[PDB]
Amino acid sequence: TLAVYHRLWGMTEQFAARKKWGWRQVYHRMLPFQIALYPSLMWYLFGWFDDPYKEAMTLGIWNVSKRSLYFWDPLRSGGDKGWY
Amino acid sequence: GKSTIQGTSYNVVKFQQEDVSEVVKEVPHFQFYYIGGEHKDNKYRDVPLDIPVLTEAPPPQLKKPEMKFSVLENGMRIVSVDKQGLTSNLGLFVHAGSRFETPAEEGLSHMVECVAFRSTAHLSHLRTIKTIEVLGMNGGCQAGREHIMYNLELLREYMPVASTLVVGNVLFPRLLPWEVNACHKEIKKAHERLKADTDQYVSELLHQTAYHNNTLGNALLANEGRALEHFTGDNIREFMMKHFSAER
């Protein structure tokens, strides 16, 4: 019967590895939350980047021609040298 | 038959010394933790239940059940029937009920029931009950007027474990002071469970009136007043030494 007791004692030998697995499973289930975080960061930090990187980050969809008709810097609406 | 005990013949099972290393090989396999795993999609996910899926089943082997009787060298009698069911019912009966209590020992039989499946020499209370649970076993202990029974209902595959756990209640029980004190709660619950069943309550009244302050009359449940004075691990152990034995 000590044999039975040995197994019943040993069934919990690897507690540290089981608790690590549980927390990894939690971390796995949080990974999908990146799909909303990373874009939201770039959305807020877009204006910090330079014009050249703004274009790459958007795959060319944004460029200087896409700056508003009334750009926040009035002297640079329609380009760095103005409209004409 | 090698031994006749109280009118019945038993086959004597001899004690043998085996290494823990060799018996471990025969213990049923089970895990408490599942740390990773091998993914495998449910193959029958698209198979309706009306379509049989099992093929090449071994032919059944049916045997007429017969009751077989054996006895260990310590004097413990073993009686078993196999109806070839898939769930087993293991029970340990001890010839120590309320009728054997002296007036100063009132309620001690019930107290033994209350401390059942607590810490043993080689297993803590929590580990005993969590094992019985993870293996899907149900059971408990009931103290009567003539006997006390420890029963466990289990899937037959896990009998090696269940037998050990049941026997440990009578072989090397650690009646630790603070674990026994935690069992005082069960007395009030027992009284409520008895009084709820009106037929059984009226039966308890009958026996107490029929046999006045003697064997069968002796109350089946301990009271929660003056009886708690000797609701102690030491007192329980002395009671067990008097009545609990392999021969009974």
Question: What is the rounded CA–CA span in Å between residue B246 and residue B237?
Answer: 15
Residue type for position B140: G
Contacts of B62 by beta carbon, 8 Å cutoff, 6+ apart? B84
What does B81-144 look like in DSSP terms, one character per residue? -----SEEEEEEEES--GGG--GGGTTHHHHHHHTTT--BTTB-HHHHHHHHHHTT-EEEEEE-
CA distance A48 to chain B (A): 44
B3-5 β-sheet, strand order? B3-5, B8-13, B68-72, B77-80
Which residues on chain B are in Cβ contact (under 8 Å) with A19? none
Length of chain A: 84
* Structure obtained using: cryo-EM
Strand-by-strand arrangement of the B138-143 sheet:
B87-94, B148-155, B138-143
Q: How many helices (H) and strands (E) does chain B have?
A: 8, 7
CB atoms within 10 A of CB B163: 18
- Taking CA–CA distances from B25, the nearest residue in chain A reads A3
- Resolution in A, one decimal? 2.5
Interface of B with A (CB under 8 A): 20, 23-24, 26-27, 30-36, 122-123, 127, 131, 160-161, 164, 167
A15: nearest CA partner in chain B: B33
Contacts A14 to B, Cβ<8 Å:
33, 35
